[PDB]
Design a protein around this ligand. Sequence first.
Ligand SMILES: [Mg+2]
Ligand SMILES: [Mg+2]
Ligand SMILES: [Mg+2]
Ligand SMILES: [Mg+2]
Ligand SMILES: [Mg+2]
Ligand SMILES: [Mg+2]
Ligand SMILES: [Mg+2]
Ligand SMILES: [Mg+2]
Ligand SMILES: [Mg+2]
Ligand SMILES: [Mg+2]
Ligand SMILES: [Mg+2]
Ligand SMILES: [Mg+2]
Ligand SMILES: [Mg+2]
Lengths: 151, 23, 55, 162, 110, 95, 288, 52
Amino acid sequence: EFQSIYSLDKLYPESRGSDTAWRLPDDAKQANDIPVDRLTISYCRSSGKVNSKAEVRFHLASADWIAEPVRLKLAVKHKNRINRSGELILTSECSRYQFRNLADCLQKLRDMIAEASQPAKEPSREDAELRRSRIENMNRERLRKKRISSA
Amino acid sequence: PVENEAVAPEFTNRNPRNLELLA
Amino acid sequence: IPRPPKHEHYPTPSGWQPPRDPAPSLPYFVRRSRMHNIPVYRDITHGNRQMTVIR
Amino acid sequence: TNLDGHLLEPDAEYVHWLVTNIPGNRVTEGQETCPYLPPFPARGSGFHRFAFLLFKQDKRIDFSGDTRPSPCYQLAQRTFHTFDFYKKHQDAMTPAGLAFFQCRWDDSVTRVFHQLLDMREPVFEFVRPPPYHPKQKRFPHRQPLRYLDRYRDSHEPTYGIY
Amino acid sequence: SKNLGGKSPGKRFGIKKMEGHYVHAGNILATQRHFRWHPGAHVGLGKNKCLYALEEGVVRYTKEVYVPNPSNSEAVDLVTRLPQGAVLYKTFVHVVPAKPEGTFKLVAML
Amino acid sequence: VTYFSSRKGKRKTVKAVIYRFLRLHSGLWLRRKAGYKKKLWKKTAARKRRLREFVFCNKTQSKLLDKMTTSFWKRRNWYADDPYQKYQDRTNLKV
Amino acid sequence: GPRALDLLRALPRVSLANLKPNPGSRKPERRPRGRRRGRKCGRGHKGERQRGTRPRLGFEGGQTPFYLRIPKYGFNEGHSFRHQYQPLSLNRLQYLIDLGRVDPTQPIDLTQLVNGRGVTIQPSKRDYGVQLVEEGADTFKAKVNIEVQMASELAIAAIEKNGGVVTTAFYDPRSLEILCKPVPFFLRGQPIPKRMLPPEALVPYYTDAKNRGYLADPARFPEARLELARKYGYVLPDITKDELFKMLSTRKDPRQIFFGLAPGWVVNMADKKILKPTDENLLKYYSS
Amino acid sequence: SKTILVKMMSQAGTGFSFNTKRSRLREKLTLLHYDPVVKKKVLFVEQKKIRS
RNA sequence: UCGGAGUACAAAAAACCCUCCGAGUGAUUUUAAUCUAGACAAACCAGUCAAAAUAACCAUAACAUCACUUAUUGAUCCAAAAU
Ligand SMILES: [Mg+2]
Ligand SMILES: [Mg+2]
Ligand SMILES: [Mg+2]
Ligand SMILES: [Mg+2]
Ligand SMILES: [Mg+2]
Ligand SMILES: [Mg+2]
Ligand SMILES: [Mg+2]
Ligand SMILES: [Mg+2]
Ligand SMILES: [Mg+2]
Ligand SMILES: [Mg+2]
Ligand SMILES: [Mg+2]
Ligand SMILES: [Mg+2]
Ligand SMILES: [Mg+2]
């Protein structure tokens, strides 16, 4: 009941009620991205280094909270981390806290979604470890260039 | 389980050129 | 020191667990601490002698 | 023969294509003992070796223990030992042809693992031994401040009793 | 009196790891003032002619032929003045690696 | 060192030790290499880096500095954004 | 059980004539008397050691001392003015709640923590209160209205997951001593003073909604809570429609030290009464 | 043959000076050095004379 | 005070008001960075090497070189610069 000059009500007259800080602005965020309830999250606390493996699995085909071109782009690009059952799997091992591990998993998911959503992706490639691959492919098709009908 | 599912996690590659080609 | 509150599920989220209502039939009893913890401690001497003390 | 790529036995090898009793050059006319299986090197361990061994034989060798079934999609059944094979049939065949190529993982190996072999694709990696550090000293003399970081389990702050 | 400055501590210029010793990467195998031991396989040479192991392994000492750098004018002159049947020999220190480069470990079945 | 002060009768500490030394709660003492600001134009880059690096003290010097300092400097400090809070404790010391 | 009690029946009376300390408890003193401990009495031959005229500790016999040839560098420079915060693990808080040291049904304060002996604050040693760390955030399953001075981002996330309230406030040393030991202050016989505002170095910390500052804009609290929940992948509990919403939303005035009490009041504990000033100047000073 | 000690300041904008020895009978020195602030080869010119 | 050779013949160390050379820097441009394993030497203070990783030059070096190259050097504190 005590009120002073520096009280919150006098400092910010716009919000005077004691329940103004506990509201839920559902109108500000209506997209509701990353429905964590639709992601399968599993924890494995390996101790002996002490770290919490966090695995986030979700069916890429059945994930209807992103667009069809986005789903196709994730399927094309991240097929190396897609299970035989179609479940995209995200791995976190950095921090000892499952909270931070899940945060890392969600950040990776958001980054992949944004990368597949943006159409200005120029597909820039590294050169330090790609020159060897380019030379090897060059020399391999140098032998493949034989032109004789078969089959 | 699947009879072929066995992995033997200690995988040994006896190819003498394997590491040379992997650089 | 207040007596610990009764919980509907054990062990507690902090790992604390109260003793059994009937005492075991063993010919010895390890009385709990004043904070209701097991009197098992670690001790160090000379900087390299490591010991465990049951009180 | 797939020399390197057997998941279980380091000293064993896989079969991929065994054709026997080839009349002269027409290999398609000769009977095939083992149906062809495309190479399936693991994703991690790369650059496996596949060898084509050609044997010239005098007699018409006929066998039943080395014959494989029509599907022949079992890795347990596709386990081979060229030394044992040549010991069994050493009297007739003599090796005269050789053709071997290196092969690494690509985007079709996962399809081969899934559709044909009916398993989960195994993934390996080239791990390295952990860096060596001497026994930690109670008083590290003239050592940098980062000396304590060489023996830290994790870069997180642990509060034991607080 | 007439002679001054003759006092100076020894520099400990000598051999640190003998043959058969198990060394780790970076260990100083031997230090020297002039070229007495030459580095060989997996042994690097510092700016002060010291020899340090580059890989973890076992130290060995061998006697081997000496082919100098063609840009080294003094050594090239010595070689060109050597007689027909003469081949230079030097004592080289080697490190024979013990541990393998790495291992292929299974991480996950996808 | 004044083992018994004339006013309070307590034990005093020399201020030079605390002005040019830092003690971690694990017992280690941290110091700066001598001559790290002198004639830098005359020294090689490796030597300058070695001088810039922080270094520890051995058992004799640590015990000497513990004798010179009092118990106020061996206490556990929880500073706000302490650079050495991670180094305050010792881990995986098998003795 | 105690068979020693039955053994004592056969033994004679326990009196002052038969008392012995534990063996090894008192090491016997040794004097410089006799053949072995005489003849220089453990002091050595001539020099400064036998005559007791040794130099000080740091002296090395005229060589420049080790503790003086090292350059001065700022290591403890300004140590007596750095802010110190006693850490309180979420694991320790859960342990206290489970053992009943602190009741989650009431707003948890520094006074409550001190009474429950969970933390020890020494304001004379430049402690500025209690900070919250995340050392036990994985197994924290309590809904409390915590009130600390500093809070970790992960600790805040862990508490909001269960549905508590985290508020970071500032306490000047005088009010901090009063909060830590209220009964001695009430026996001191002085009116409750006002709570000093944080300095310019700590105003940004306590006026941001990301740190749940007590001087922060309450309108930005839901936005920060939603951002935290989205970052850490948990649903934000419906705190407003909780049964204990009053206890969760109770707050202290930025010039208020205790709950309910106001600056300028005198707590007469002998008569169990409160004296409130009524002078206009006194009221203006205490409410300003 | 007395030398001189000269402090050179970078011309890359950032304040970065290094000391180098130079002969007294030489003109104002100007070289190419490495500036850690910008991590590039930058022209350095003699700004001050410190030691003889 | 510092370095080289003999004393001190073959890992290291090793003294004399012992026998001899030297140093208290010059010339030139390639103006020679950060971070970090592991080591030499060492009472301490100091002195030495150095793999991997980083930004700029060949997209293949950077340890500045030579003068027997080894010595060409001075701790805190305190004073000055522009930090
Ligand atoms: Mg003890
Ligand atoms: Mg000599
Ligand atoms: Mg000497
Ligand atoms: Mg005695
Ligand atoms: Mg006595
Ligand atoms: Mg005696
Ligand atoms: Mg006598
Ligand atoms: Mg004497
Ligand atoms: Mg006498
Ligand atoms: Mg003197
Ligand atoms: Mg304290
Ligand atoms: Mg040694
Ligand atoms: Mg390198």
